[PDB]
Amino acid sequence: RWLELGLTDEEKQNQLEQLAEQYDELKHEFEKKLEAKRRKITQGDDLAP
Amino acid sequence: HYIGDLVQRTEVELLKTPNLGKKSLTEIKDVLASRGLSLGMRLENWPPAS
Amino acid sequence: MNKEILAVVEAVSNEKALPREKIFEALESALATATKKKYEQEIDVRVQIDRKSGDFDTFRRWLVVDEVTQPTKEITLEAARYEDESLNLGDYVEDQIESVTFDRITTQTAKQVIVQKVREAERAMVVDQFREHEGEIITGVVKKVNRDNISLDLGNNAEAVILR
Amino acid sequence: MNLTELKNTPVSELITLGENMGLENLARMRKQDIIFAILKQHAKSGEDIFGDGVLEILQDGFGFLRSADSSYLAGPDDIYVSPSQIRRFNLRTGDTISGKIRPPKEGERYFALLKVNEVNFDKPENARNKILFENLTPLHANSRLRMERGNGSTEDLTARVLDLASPIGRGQRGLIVAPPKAGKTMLLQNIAQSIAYNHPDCVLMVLLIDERPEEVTEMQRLVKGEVVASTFDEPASRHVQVAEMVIEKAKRLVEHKKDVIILLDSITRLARAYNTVVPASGKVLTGGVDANALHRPKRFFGAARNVEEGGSLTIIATALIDTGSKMDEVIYEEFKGTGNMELHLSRKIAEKRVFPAIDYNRSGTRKEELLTTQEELQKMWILRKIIHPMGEIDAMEFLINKLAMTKTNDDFFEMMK
Amino acid sequence: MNLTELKNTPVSELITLGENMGLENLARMRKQDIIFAILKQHAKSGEDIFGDGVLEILQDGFGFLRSADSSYLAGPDDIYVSPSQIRRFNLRTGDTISGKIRPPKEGERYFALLKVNEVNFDKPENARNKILFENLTPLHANSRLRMERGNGSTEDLTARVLDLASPIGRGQRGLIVAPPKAGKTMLLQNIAQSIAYNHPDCVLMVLLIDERPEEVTEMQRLVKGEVVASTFDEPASRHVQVAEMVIEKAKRLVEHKKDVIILLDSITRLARAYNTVVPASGKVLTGGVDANALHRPKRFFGAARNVEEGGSLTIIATALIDTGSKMDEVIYEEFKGTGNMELHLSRKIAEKRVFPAIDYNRSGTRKEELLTTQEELQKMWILRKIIHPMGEIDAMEFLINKLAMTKTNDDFFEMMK
Amino acid sequence: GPEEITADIPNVGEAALSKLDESGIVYIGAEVTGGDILVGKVTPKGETQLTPEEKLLRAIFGEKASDVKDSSLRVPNGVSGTVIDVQVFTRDGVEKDKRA
Ligand SMILES: Nc1ncnc2c1ncn2[C@@H]1O[C@H](COP(=O)(O)OP(=O)(O)O)[C@@H](O)[C@H]1O
Ligand SMILES: Nc1ncnc2c1ncn2[C@@H]1O[C@H](COP(=O)(O)OP(=O)(O)O)[C@@H](O)[C@H]1O
Ligand code: BEF
Ligand code: BEF
Ligand SMILES: [Mg+2]
Ligand SMILES: [Mg+2]
């Protein structure tokens, strides 16, 4: 829960930022998948007039 | 370990034991006394024979 | 939900004949009986539905006595050092919270006990307001006759009994 | 680990302390969450906690212990107390209590009071042996509360003229009548300083209702005493709440045979608050005040009296006039003949930047004969006769000069011969 | 490709730029859709985007980055930020942030913040090491903010009389009390110009709530500073929204140890807005204002203070009086004794077309002794004593003449001897 | 008036309704051997505009719900077994019951 670290910018900051970006992108993609599934299963279906 | 080592112990010696608050104490007083007996009694025939 | 509770307390016919406070007391009794019928063990529970500020929150009454039968509602008169009692009697706990008060059996027992409580309260009220006139001649039509007693109506659903 | 030990030290000490204790960044939380998390993490190491605070009764039955850091309001660090303790140990609003406390147990969110150790600086055993407030027999003020420092500093004049204009006593009823920006704040600060220096035995408390935060922060570090305040950042509900808190604290303390002195600033703000929190009763007069909207100010002010068995409650509030709105005036109107001592400050004198700007003959004290001796009373009458034919402004200047020549008022009185 | 680079240049540059980039006719879209489509088509060529904006917290957890082009409102070009970034880097309302951004990804509609680079003109590494606002110890104003230009232009008089009527300092609490059409706009413009010239280190911001669009467009190109406004084209929801935006921006900036100066015009419009967006609480007084409808103006105004560790927040708002409706009056009423500095402009002086129309002795500053030196204070007292016996109008004319003869106020003071 | 799937079935006791839930659908795992109402379908027959106050009143006080027709669906006489799954589909707009 404490990914926050920092020292020796040149490469450490680059790699840490790349990995944090991958992490947040993965979390956002999974949240998008969950929200799509929710909107899909909660969408009411037509039955008849 | 044994139940006979616990029936001879009034609940006065439980809430003083750590990690014994509300849920644990309620579970203990429920699952132990619902079988007819109770927690805290005076008996001398223990343990026969171990 | 609690919005349904407010709709119920506001959709009563005899509003002042049974005010919000005693309405919510009857509902507390309803939820207590419901929680009693939920668990196989017998345990007294107060609700305190929080008439206007918030929702309900069940509790766990102890009924402090030196007995141990069903220790869910048993605690000695001296257990006061830990769990912050510091008393001799009346020590009750607030362990279990947020029961369910809208399922089938809960709704059934609620409706039944509410009917009972409202009819009892209204009968006692219509009798008590006439109690101040004890020892006076009153009018009123009879309602029903029988071989043991008869019923009389003094107006505004005032039920009176006249024995044989 | 006591609650007050974290209650009084500034936020910076809390920061370094929590950063030492290996905490989540406490700089993201409020003072109350700071103390809450620090006490949490301290108890997580296995210590039994001690605490203190003033009790507030709730309508659900239970009570809550507040501190002067929150100005006696709801907070995460308030200590919950069951109604049954209030029953057995006879608790009520205003009872300050210190004793054994623990953090909220499993599923709770507020501290619990285990063991009572001090009720209003008394043994909880004798706390049940108390006398009520309304059953008291009030009296006039007999003991003199000398306000003169005697050191003869430059500002001390504003105190000596006190002893020459309107005497004070234990349990006095005083009203400060002055327009805005006339010098009430410096006067009140000098009053508090002189009382805390000459009478350190009586508890000193000050009310700031709907004031500026700079005045609050300057007051809380200028007087030697625990102060409470409420700025305009907050609704009038907070003002009335702190009003019951302070008035019940004073009541319980004087019931414990203690001399309480409250300096309220200002009663006009408190009247506005009481009027705006009270519901409409259909009884409206000029200004926009409800008829029952003044019952609460009348209650708060009539709380002042001098007890015979021991102790007293002096209440000195300032009222605002000449504010352009008639409503304020009406307030002052009903507070015209209710007080037996008044400090009248006219803006005409303060307009010349000559301080203190006090109207002498418009000020006075009822039944002041029992507060001073015969020589002092005769000299007061002579001074009043000398100052009466002259006006307000340069006559006040005359008093200021005659006061600045002498060191204390004994030399001034002897010179007046 | 930065967001501000398209944020500040006029619509015409955007037109030619998009017409160069081979676009659908961008003249059919709004400014926000212009920037949105241009950034879309730029990223469609394969560039990583940079952006900036002020954060707004939403109740669903996530945040949105707004710009001053939309006056801090919802728009298609607002940058979405997840709540987890707000957690890790400790974000909140008012935190201006600039860093790596990308257009909304597949199926999304708002820009996403990749990498934080500047939090309130600071490193995001130290952004977590901040001090809160309410934990601050307020004080009085000590540093003087000289408003005089010294060049002696024709309009500069309206500034010099400032240094002669009501001194300003860092963290001052000022209220402009004037009837409509008396000259508040030119006064505020001169205030902004003088501050931006003499003190370019402190950030300068201005609030225009329910104003005319011509005044907004004249303000946004007369002062050297980023301005925000809200005309009457928009509901009061927009006004309260921009109110939180600006007040939280000022709060975060002063938390970052920066001196913020906000010029609000007018507080009467803001009070009307706050009253009309607040729901009814059953507490109505004269004028039609709810009792809790004023809690938000009280909050916004009490936000002003002088911090001790570093930085300050000066808030100078104008109030409207003599508008024929009692409601406005009641507003000014509760804002009567809340401020420690006031600029009183009477319509009687502005009626003669003599500017600036300032009421001298009705104006003043509380605790102004800590803002100026001893010589300056003594000269101020002498000037007040000279101007007091005379009236308002031609006495103001006398001050205007005595100011126009000398070049700066040093010569005026020496001549007053 | 449209139909309702509530649990207020008049002209019948509680034994036939003991297998119904709070919403008006038989529980998941409730056996049935004879003709038993497993869903509380009611339809209004006459005047509409039954006030919600009087609606909840009829469930507690007053007379029975008249415009119901007791058109609920029960299992045919002859089939037995235990229900294992219930399916419900709600058109966009109708209040989704808590079982859905
Ligand atoms: N004892 C005193 N000595 C010197 N100046 C004083 C004294 N009392 C008041 N003042 C002046 O009065 C002003 C006080 O302002 P303030 O505290 O706002 O008054 P109020 O609280 O009555 O509105 C200061 O500018 C100060 O110069
Ligand atoms: N300080 C000043 N210098 C020059 N002209 C002024 C000044 N103050 C007011 N005026 C004149 O008065 C008018 C002010 O208009 P406006 O801004 O609407 O007044 P207010 O802001 O008081 O409502 C302008 O036409 C301007 O020519
Ligand atoms: F303190 Be001043 F009287 F507002
Ligand atoms: F801008 Be004006 F004073 F209405
Ligand atoms: Mg003051
Ligand atoms: Mg203008």
mmCIF file of N, CA and C in Angstrom, chain D residues 68-126:
data_model
loop_
_atom_site.group_PDB
_atom_site.id
_atom_site.type_symbol
_atom_site.label_atom_id
_atom_site.label_comp_id
_atom_site.label_asym_id
_atom_site.label_seq_id
_atom_site.Cartn_x
_atom_site.Cartn_y
_atom_site.Cartn_z
ATOM 1 N N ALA D 68 -11.801 22.461 25.865
ATOM 2 C CA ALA D 68 -11.718 23.865 25.485
ATOM 3 C C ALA D 68 -10.952 24.065 24.183
ATOM 4 N N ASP D 69 -10.291 23.010 23.686
ATOM 5 C CA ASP D 69 -9.649 23.046 22.372
ATOM 6 C C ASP D 69 -10.683 23.108 21.257
ATOM 7 N N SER D 70 -11.784 22.366 21.406
ATOM 8 C CA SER D 70 -12.907 22.431 20.488
ATOM 9 C C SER D 70 -13.919 23.487 20.902
ATOM 10 N N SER D 71 -13.571 24.314 21.891
ATOM 11 C CA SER D 71 -14.489 25.287 22.482
ATOM 12 C C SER D 71 -15.779 24.608 22.935
ATOM 13 N N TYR D 72 -15.638 23.412 23.511
ATOM 14 C CA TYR D 72 -16.762 22.649 24.056
ATOM 15 C C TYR D 72 -17.761 22.265 22.963
ATOM 16 N N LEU D 73 -17.269 21.611 21.910
ATOM 17 C CA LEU D 73 -18.126 21.140 20.829
ATOM 18 C C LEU D 73 -17.924 19.659 20.546
ATOM 19 N N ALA D 74 -18.746 19.147 19.634
ATOM 20 C CA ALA D 74 -18.640 17.760 19.213
ATOM 21 C C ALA D 74 -17.358 17.548 18.418
ATOM 22 N N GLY D 75 -16.649 16.470 18.737
ATOM 23 C CA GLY D 75 -15.424 16.122 18.065
ATOM 24 C C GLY D 75 -15.137 14.641 18.192
ATOM 25 N N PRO D 76 -14.201 14.139 17.384
ATOM 26 C CA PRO D 76 -13.854 12.712 17.459
ATOM 27 C C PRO D 76 -13.252 12.294 18.789
ATOM 28 N N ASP D 77 -12.659 13.217 19.547
ATOM 29 C CA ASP D 77 -12.001 12.883 20.805
ATOM 30 C C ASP D 77 -12.887 13.135 22.020
ATOM 31 N N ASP D 78 -14.178 13.382 21.815
ATOM 32 C CA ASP D 78 -15.087 13.573 22.935
ATOM 33 C C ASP D 78 -15.327 12.246 23.642
ATOM 34 N N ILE D 79 -15.409 12.295 24.968
ATOM 35 C CA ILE D 79 -15.496 11.080 25.772
ATOM 36 C C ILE D 79 -16.960 10.775 26.063
ATOM 37 N N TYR D 80 -17.441 9.643 25.561
ATOM 38 C CA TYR D 80 -18.811 9.226 25.824
ATOM 39 C C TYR D 80 -18.959 8.755 27.266
ATOM 40 N N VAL D 81 -20.087 9.105 27.886
ATOM 41 C CA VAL D 81 -20.415 8.659 29.237
ATOM 42 C C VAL D 81 -21.862 8.179 29.241
ATOM 43 N N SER D 82 -22.098 7.044 29.895
ATOM 44 C CA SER D 82 -23.428 6.465 29.962
ATOM 45 C C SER D 82 -24.322 7.272 30.905
ATOM 46 N N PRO D 83 -25.642 7.227 30.702
ATOM 47 C CA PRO D 83 -26.548 7.934 31.622
ATOM 48 C C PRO D 83 -26.514 7.386 33.035
ATOM 49 N N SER D 84 -26.125 6.123 33.211
ATOM 50 C CA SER D 84 -26.154 5.512 34.535
ATOM 51 C C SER D 84 -25.056 6.065 35.437
ATOM 52 N N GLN D 85 -23.906 6.425 34.861
ATOM 53 C CA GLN D 85 -22.910 7.160 35.636
ATOM 54 C C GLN D 85 -23.442 8.525 36.052
ATOM 55 N N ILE D 86 -24.121 9.215 35.133
ATOM 56 C CA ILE D 86 -24.747 10.497 35.449
ATOM 57 C C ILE D 86 -25.740 10.330 36.592
ATOM 58 N N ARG D 87 -26.416 9.184 36.639
ATOM 59 C CA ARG D 87 -27.289 8.878 37.764
ATOM 60 C C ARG D 87 -26.520 8.665 39.059
ATOM 61 N N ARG D 88 -25.594 7.706 39.079
ATOM 62 C CA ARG D 88 -24.983 7.298 40.340
ATOM 63 C C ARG D 88 -24.133 8.412 40.932
ATOM 64 N N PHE D 89 -23.253 9.011 40.130
ATOM 65 C CA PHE D 89 -22.373 10.062 40.619
ATOM 66 C C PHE D 89 -22.979 11.449 40.466
ATOM 67 N N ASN D 90 -24.255 11.535 40.085
ATOM 68 C CA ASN D 90 -24.993 12.797 40.047
ATOM 69 C C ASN D 90 -24.299 13.822 39.149
ATOM 70 N N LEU D 91 -24.208 13.492 37.865
ATOM 71 C CA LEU D 91 -23.594 14.389 36.896
ATOM 72 C C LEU D 91 -24.651 15.278 36.254
ATOM 73 N N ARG D 92 -24.194 16.387 35.674
ATOM 74 C CA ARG D 92 -25.048 17.299 34.928
ATOM 75 C C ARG D 92 -24.155 18.225 34.113
ATOM 76 N N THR D 93 -24.782 19.045 33.275
ATOM 77 C CA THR D 93 -24.046 19.993 32.450
ATOM 78 C C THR D 93 -23.183 20.908 33.309
ATOM 79 N N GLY D 94 -21.950 21.132 32.861
ATOM 80 C CA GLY D 94 -21.003 21.970 33.562
ATOM 81 C C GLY D 94 -20.036 21.224 34.457
ATOM 82 N N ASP D 95 -20.379 20.012 34.884
ATOM 83 C CA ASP D 95 -19.477 19.228 35.715
ATOM 84 C C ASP D 95 -18.242 18.830 34.921
ATOM 85 N N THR D 96 -17.113 19.463 35.230
ATOM 86 C CA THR D 96 -15.840 19.059 34.645
ATOM 87 C C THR D 96 -15.368 17.814 35.390
ATOM 88 N N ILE D 97 -14.897 16.828 34.638
ATOM 89 C CA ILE D 97 -14.590 15.509 35.171
ATOM 90 C C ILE D 97 -13.276 15.030 34.575
ATOM 91 N N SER D 98 -12.426 14.450 35.420
ATOM 92 C CA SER D 98 -11.175 13.847 34.974
ATOM 93 C C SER D 98 -11.036 12.475 35.610
ATOM 94 N N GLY D 99 -10.626 11.498 34.811
ATOM 95 C CA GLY D 99 -10.435 10.159 35.335
ATOM 96 C C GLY D 99 -9.994 9.180 34.268
ATOM 97 N N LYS D 100 -10.155 7.899 34.598
ATOM 98 C CA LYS D 100 -9.747 6.803 33.729
ATOM 99 C C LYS D 100 -10.572 6.803 32.448
ATOM 100 N N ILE D 101 -9.889 6.733 31.305
ATOM 101 C CA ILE D 101 -10.549 6.656 30.009
ATOM 102 C C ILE D 101 -9.849 5.619 29.139
ATOM 103 N N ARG D 102 -10.595 5.104 28.169
ATOM 104 C CA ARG D 102 -10.103 4.196 27.149
ATOM 105 C C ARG D 102 -10.621 4.654 25.792
ATOM 106 N N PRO D 103 -9.914 4.329 24.717
ATOM 107 C CA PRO D 103 -10.436 4.620 23.381
ATOM 108 C C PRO D 103 -11.714 3.848 23.127
ATOM 109 N N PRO D 104 -12.480 4.216 22.100
ATOM 110 C CA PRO D 104 -13.706 3.470 21.798
ATOM 111 C C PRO D 104 -13.399 2.008 21.520
ATOM 112 N N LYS D 105 -14.178 1.122 22.139
ATOM 113 C CA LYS D 105 -13.939 -0.305 21.981
ATOM 114 C C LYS D 105 -14.520 -0.773 20.644
ATOM 115 N N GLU D 106 -14.631 -2.088 20.488
ATOM 116 C CA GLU D 106 -14.701 -2.695 19.167
ATOM 117 C C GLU D 106 -16.012 -2.325 18.476
ATOM 118 N N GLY D 107 -15.922 -1.467 17.459
ATOM 119 C CA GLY D 107 -17.087 -0.978 16.752
ATOM 120 C C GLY D 107 -17.577 0.387 17.184
ATOM 121 N N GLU D 108 -17.033 0.944 18.262
ATOM 122 C CA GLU D 108 -17.413 2.259 18.754
ATOM 123 C C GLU D 108 -16.512 3.323 18.137
ATOM 124 N N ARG D 109 -16.870 4.592 18.363
ATOM 125 C CA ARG D 109 -16.140 5.700 17.756
ATOM 126 C C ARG D 109 -15.808 6.828 18.726
ATOM 127 N N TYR D 110 -16.119 6.691 20.013
ATOM 128 C CA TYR D 110 -15.835 7.739 20.982
ATOM 129 C C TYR D 110 -15.316 7.126 22.275
ATOM 130 N N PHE D 111 -14.434 7.866 22.944
ATOM 131 C CA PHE D 111 -13.799 7.392 24.166
ATOM 132 C C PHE D 111 -14.837 7.141 25.255
ATOM 133 N N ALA D 112 -14.536 6.184 26.128
ATOM 134 C CA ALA D 112 -15.419 5.806 27.222
ATOM 135 C C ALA D 112 -14.769 6.148 28.554
ATOM 136 N N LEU D 113 -15.582 6.628 29.493
ATOM 137 C CA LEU D 113 -15.102 6.990 30.820
ATOM 138 C C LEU D 113 -15.227 5.794 31.757
ATOM 139 N N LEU D 114 -14.089 5.301 32.242
ATOM 140 C CA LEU D 114 -14.075 4.136 33.121
ATOM 141 C C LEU D 114 -14.315 4.520 34.575
ATOM 142 N N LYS D 115 -13.488 5.418 35.102
ATOM 143 C CA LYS D 115 -13.379 5.635 36.537
ATOM 144 C C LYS D 115 -13.235 7.123 36.807
ATOM 145 N N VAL D 116 -14.182 7.682 37.558
ATOM 146 C CA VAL D 116 -14.170 9.110 37.845
ATOM 147 C C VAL D 116 -13.220 9.392 39.003
ATOM 148 N N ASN D 117 -12.355 10.390 38.826
ATOM 149 C CA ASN D 117 -11.360 10.740 39.831
ATOM 150 C C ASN D 117 -11.469 12.166 40.344
ATOM 151 N N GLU D 118 -11.959 13.101 39.533
ATOM 152 C CA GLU D 118 -12.084 14.491 39.957
ATOM 153 C C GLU D 118 -13.314 15.104 39.310
ATOM 154 N N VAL D 119 -14.266 15.535 40.136
ATOM 155 C CA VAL D 119 -15.483 16.195 39.676
ATOM 156 C C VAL D 119 -15.409 17.650 40.116
ATOM 157 N N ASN D 120 -15.148 18.545 39.163
ATOM 158 C CA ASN D 120 -15.046 19.980 39.429
ATOM 159 C C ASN D 120 -13.986 20.267 40.491
ATOM 160 N N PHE D 121 -12.811 19.660 40.313
ATOM 161 C CA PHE D 121 -11.696 19.792 41.253
ATOM 162 C C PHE D 121 -12.120 19.396 42.665
ATOM 163 N N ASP D 122 -12.804 18.262 42.765
ATOM 164 C CA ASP D 122 -13.248 17.725 44.040
ATOM 165 C C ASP D 122 -13.225 16.207 43.953
ATOM 166 N N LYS D 123 -13.302 15.572 45.114
ATOM 167 C CA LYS D 123 -13.444 14.129 45.151
ATOM 168 C C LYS D 123 -14.829 13.740 44.637
ATOM 169 N N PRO D 124 -14.919 12.751 43.744
ATOM 170 C CA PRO D 124 -16.245 12.284 43.304
ATOM 171 C C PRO D 124 -17.086 11.719 44.433
ATOM 172 N N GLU D 125 -16.501 11.512 45.614
ATOM 173 C CA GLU D 125 -17.263 11.007 46.749
ATOM 174 C C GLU D 125 -18.142 12.097 47.349
ATOM 175 N N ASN D 126 -17.624 13.324 47.435
ATOM 176 C CA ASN D 126 -18.388 14.462 47.930
ATOM 177 C C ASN D 126 -19.146 15.195 46.831
#
